[PDB]
């Protein structure tokens, strides 16, 4: 089903909706790592997952900062 | 002065020795230029006879005419690439 | 390939500083005064604003000296390290190193020093700081721990070389040297 | 030395007062830091010892003579870039003061050099993801360093989204590898190089292919490069390829152990497609930076053929090409940052809006450079002639060496297409040379006083007043003669590349 | 000595000329002495360097031995081994001789920037001269392609109305094809690990791999010596390039492609050259017949001479692929004779008429033998030489090339004899029209040939008739060199 | 070996001479400039020859091993 690229129908029509899809996409990677690590009883996989959660947070903050300044750049008359 | 030809054959040398291989090519070139020089001499003998004989040129110049038409196909420059790169025995 | 004797695959930080040659201090001094000079040299090359030479403000010269103070030390630290690894001239250090170790084994103390770090922590520390000077141009990392993975065979400090027997040091068998792996696992095979 | 000095620059910059002279002086502090880094690096790191390959920091980082070559190259090219922001590129206060309006510019650049230099050394999938983010995050910030600009911010937003998807693909490949084997260290994975799905390493490459702008992903790179300020485009269009292409070469070195043909066909499909777009794309373009964006894609296509072939001659082809292409790229962009002083000024039709971010934006703004400055026009001509591949410049030896590596491994189809694609691309390199010179003899005697350079004040009227600053002129001249006169020392340089090893040994 | 003296002096000369002209640029307007008389001092220094280049080679011509087989004057400079043999020596002599003549032809007919033109002309001549004296395929290719950078700029800067089309033609035609010659050079470096001439002459390759390398190399050659159907660049470039660029592009650049056969095809790819020789004859005979017929319908004066260049070069390729000494010696003498007659015509057509009336259309010129008699004597004299009249050096080249063609292949090689008739059709029609009927009603009476333009003509005609009357000057150098190119095993 | 640094220095003179044209100044401007650009490249030229001589020593030793490996292959 997803070979027809169904996930494109599931992503909204705003720049903020793309940002969320990136997080939900990466969330799948971390859940996959936690799954393998627990079955193998391997904590190295859990170190990887902890890094992925922390790195996925820094990516969100930078992306939102760019989006925020993108928004105020239009609303930059400020001649009052 | 009159340099002597380095009489050398492709069949006795190693082509890895590019100094000797050069002589085998230079020796095969020089002998061929002799045959043309031999040929040009023989043709001169034919020309005197025909001019001197006149009507009898068919008789007094019989074997020279025969020999000249025999040496003509092979008394020409042929290079060395033919014999260097081919093996008649095989 | 210029190869010499491997004094220490992971030289300790305090050892590396104590082994600076006078020339190493010169490099540290040159690096310290080079960075403020390079700022001046650029201004002589090209003024920052305008068209005429203007001495940079003193505040820039103080931060420039600090930046060149670490850079000079880092260059000094890496050059001193090559000698330990054997990549450079280390005959002078080899005798100096051998004198300290032969003295150390003689007092039955460990050559490597006593350590707060347990067996796993000692070996883990060695992994981080071994060959860490290769990226010392990018970020700093020093061997500040008394571990035991130095890439040498302590047997080689028993044989006497030229000019050493005069030291008259007595070396006990390694089995009686305090704080060594060959002298710790006497009661249990997994506890030192 | 890099990391320690970065903290000092971070703190110091946040203390002193916001001014252009202090901002420009701090940029000259970073130029020292990068220089100091190179002296410490070259001191401890040697080709003769790093030949075997040395593990560092609990095997997370592995360094050998192939990686070590690029770290020094990256440091060198980062010196030539910082010279732009640290000195005058024109000397006209209006145009130049843009480079000094930002105090965190040099800090972010120093952040990236740490990111760039560590990426080729990675040896763990856990640190591969961390380092690739450190480099990726630094580029987005540098793209948006001029936060007032509408196009710059729009580009960083486009850059962040594409890179985020690119990083997710990279992260997902590593997770899949960990799922199969449970191992994170790359050396431990090599023990199971025959037991794992080799296409999961290809999914890793598909993420690194996005970040170098390879077709079909080329669309965003062309848009990004044609919107950022020319000083920014000069950095973000070259540096990522220096450190990612080195990483791609190593990953392909491990991949060719099992010599899977299906992997090579897909990559050949992308290399073949990219040459087509890299050549036919630039035929119909007006913006110079869009032109150099298509030019960049074509050269990356050539450099992948050397990577894809991956033999003993592929190290030589890649090591030489990546060096000459960087110097050519710096030389061309440095000239474009200078020749903006010869632009005319209105006293109309087509309403072309120019900004202080890209004063030179269109190819026909290079018009009559043969008249305004003949010496620098030839330098741009020599640089473009290298990109064309006219011998005996540096560019010819790059294509000649790449062809050897390509054909020696049986890539006949790609070798012919690259030679077709090179000739097609010569059309749009020739247009730059057509604009530079072809209308010289009609314009030879013209009354020109409306140039931007004619708004410079007259100092004395007795002393000689050079038109171009000192440092930028010396860099342009040096790299133009190195490009032109490589034939003199070519044999030594190539024999200096035979020694760069990646586990060849014996 | 040779190459080292030939490069170092020319580099010194180029630097000297640049220093003198660009000194006064500065920040102030300059009215110096070197600009006076249209850069006359700077043009003179350019003309002297062309004469001195000839003196360098003659210093080494004296040492040349005609009875030694093998490269002489071998030296290594820039990690490249150079050298001279019989064939290469004469082509070098032709290339440097056209140096002063190319510069002298453009003495006062450029709108400006004479220093740039003088530097480029001496640069192109040196690059082409050095192309005959290298000893590896890679260095051959380097010099074979480096001439594009000045030639493309020179034609674009100094060209005629369509200079942009002409510039875009020489750059792309001669690069998109010579890149195919790079592929076959690369493959030689992959299997043999060397591209040196001598090393690769002794190796035999598989007859499949011989066919690939030949196809690659002959693609790069069929464009430089324009063979149909890839000749479309030459007529366009000739009609638009500067007059000096036409003398080099016709005098020398075409002959680099015949020399390409001598080094790159016959010695090392000898077995596959025999196979392609029937095909080469088909392409060249059709080039000979079609180029002659196409010329009959042309209108531009300088195009008409351009196509006459293609017909002769087809005959040169016909002779050189004949496997005998007669064809090879004839082809090389024709290249030398065409190297003087072809530039002479462009002077007559694009250098004497075009500098007076500035129009190349044939319709405006007729009856020129009335008020320009000295022009019509040389046009008549050079018309005959261009068509193989027995006393010129072209007849010796064409007769031998035709003779060698029949020897190699009696049936189809005999069609080369159509060169004698067709060359007289388009050429004599052009001359008969120019110097016939009443003087044209569209032109105005002006000066006849000036003293400079007589000097150019006399010294392109004098070498032509010496080679015609006594061609053994060329032959005594060629014979031992040209005899190493023949492949035949007779038993 | 001085002649090798002589050539490198003369390349240093060319770059400063080529810098003058780009700046559009008389070629006699600031004669001390040619000394600095000359000495800069002699420093580079000095190091460059050290690097190439170092390459010769390394390449001779590597080829010693490569020749042996080929003989094992050619058995
Ligand atoms: C101590 C004060 C100091 O070092 O600099 C004075 C500096 C000058 O203050 P200021 O009066 O506002 O400066 C005015 C001048 O124009 C500022 O310009 P300046 O040139 O006068 O000083 C700036 C300073 C550059 O400042 C720094 O690099 C401080 C870095 C610390 C982080 O450059 C230098 O002066 C070099 C000499 C001191 C640098 C110390 C380098 C070794 C690290 C210790 O003050 C600081 O920067 C304070 C930073 C310390 C913050 C607290 C850090 C606590 C960390 C340890 C806590 C846990 C244990
Ligand atoms: C982008 C990513 C960026 C990443 C990089 C970010 C920055 C990270 C790099 C920073 C350093 C990384 C390493 C930190 C992790 C390791 C910590 C650790 O191993 O704890 C175990 C370690 C305990 O191991 P241990 O077996 O008891 O070894 C005892 C001594 O450490 C060693 O005993 P000893 O035989 O060497 O000599 C004892 C005596 C020296 O005895 C002598 O022989 C006299 C030497 C004459 C003085 C030499 C000049 C002093 C320095 C100039 O005291 C010392 O001087 C020891 C050297 C420590 C002085 C300060 C070192 C600064 C390095 C930074 O904890 C420490 O005692 C470390 C003390 C130093 C504090 C850390 C330095 C950084 C702050
Ligand atoms: C000690 C740490 C701070 C250094 C401060 C001492 C100093 O060097 O003074 C700055 C120096 C002269 O001071 P100055 O500003 O001219 O006098 C006051 C006039 N209002 O102005 C200068 O010319 C700069 C000289 C710098 C001297 C070296 C500073 C080293 C700083 C320590 C680095 C390691 C910590
Ligand atoms: C830097 C200060 C270095 C001097 C120091 O106090 O550290 C040495 C100390 C050694 O203590 P010691 O009991 O002699 O260890 C051997 C026992 N077998 O080492 C220690 O025991 C503790 C070291 C703690 C010092 C670290 C504090 C610096 C701040 C950390 C960042
Ligand atoms: C400025 C250029 C500085 C060149 C410094 C290069 C260098 O020092 O290292 C050369 C490096 C060889 O080093 P390695 O083989 O590892 O062993 C020896 C180390 N002691 O060789 C390498 O592999 C480095 C590869 C990159 C080389 C790039 C070529 C340098 C380009 C020169 C640019 C000059 C620009 C003009 C400067 C103007 C300054 C105002
Ligand atoms: C303005 C002038 C333009 C240029 C001039 C054009 C003419 C030049 C080309 C024609 C050359 C002369 C004709 C070629 C044949 C003459 C040579 C000859 O005698 O051929 C004989 C030869 C074998 O002879 P035979 O003994 O009969 O065969 C049995 C062998 N056991 O082999 C044969 O049997 C040949 C058979 C007859 C020849 C067939 C081909 C003739 C050419 C046709 C071209 C058409 C256009
Ligand atoms: C003043 C002293 C000059 C330098 C003298 C020197 O160091 O000798 C090097 C060389 C002399 O020649 P040699 O060493 O015997 O072997 C050939 C190597 N070129 O002499 C040289 O290498 C100088 C050659 C440099 C000038 C030629 C530059 C070539 C420019 C491109 C030419 C186009 C080629 C296609
Ligand atoms: C051991 C050898 C070291 C040599 C010196 C190196 C540092 C250069 C600084 C000299 C002092 C200076 O900058 O002097 C100033 C001069 C002249 O400047 P100008 O253009 O006339 O400006 C106008 C001057 N007014 C104000 C008088 C009008 O600048 C130069 O000529 C710079 C030369 C370029 C740097 C050469 C470095 C080559 C790098 C090669 C390695 C890859
Ligand atoms: C034997 C090989 C040696 C290497 C030569 C390298 C060329 C660099 C010369 C720079 C000198 C300069 O920029 O000077 C400019 C000079 C002379 O200009 P002008 O008419 O006097 O000035 C004009 C302005 N005025 C009159 C108002 C003052 O023109 C040249 O450049 C011509 C030669 C180079 C053109 C083609 C370059 C292609 C490079 C690639 C070749 C493979
Ligand atoms: C306006 C001007 C237009 C142009 C005019 C032409 C100028 C010619 C200058 C002559 C100089 C000369 O003679 O150089 C001679 C010197 C030293 O030669 P050597 O000691 O024998 O070294 C060995 C040389 N082999 C192999 C010939 C024997 O080599 C050089 O410095 C080389 C020039 C530098 C090229 C760039 C490579 C180095 C940087 C690497 C980064 C990729």
Numbering used by the authors:
A (entry chain K): 1 to 80
B (entry chain p): 3 to 92
C (entry chain O): 1 to 192
D (entry chain N): 1 to 347, 365 to 523
E (entry chain M): 1 to 491
F (entry chain d): 1 to 75
What does the original paper state about this entry?
The process catalyzed by CI comprises a redox reaction coupled to proton translocation across the inner mitochondrial membrane. In the hydrophilic domain, two electrons are passed from NADH to ubiquinone [typically ubiquinone-10 (Q10)] via a flavin mononucleotide (FMN) and an extended chain of iron-sulfur (FeS) clusters, forming ubiquinol, which is reoxidized to sustain the electron transport chain and reduce O2 to H2O. Here, we report the structure of isolated CI from the yeast Pichia pastoris (Pp-CI) and identify distinct closed and open states that resemble those of mammalian CI.
Our further analyses thus focus on states 1 and 3 (which both contain the flavoprotein subcomplex, with and without the bridge subunit, respectively) that refined to final resolutions of 2.8 and 3.3 Å, respectively. The open state of Pp-CI observed here is an intermediate-level open state, with two elements in the membrane domain (TMH3ND6 in its π-bulge conformation and Tyr156ND1 flipped out of the E-channel) and the region of disorder observed in THM1–2ND3 (that facilitates NEM labeling) in open-type conformations but retaining the intact Tyr141ND1 trigonal junction (with Cys52ND3 and His107NDUFS2) and closed-like loops conformations around the Q10-binding site. Last, as also observed in twisted D. melanogaster and the Open1 state observed recently in mammalian CI, the Q10-binding site of open-state Pp-CI remains sealed to the matrix. In this way, the behavior of the Pp-CI closed and open states matches that of the biochemically defined “active” (closed) and “deactive” (open) resting states of mammalian CI.
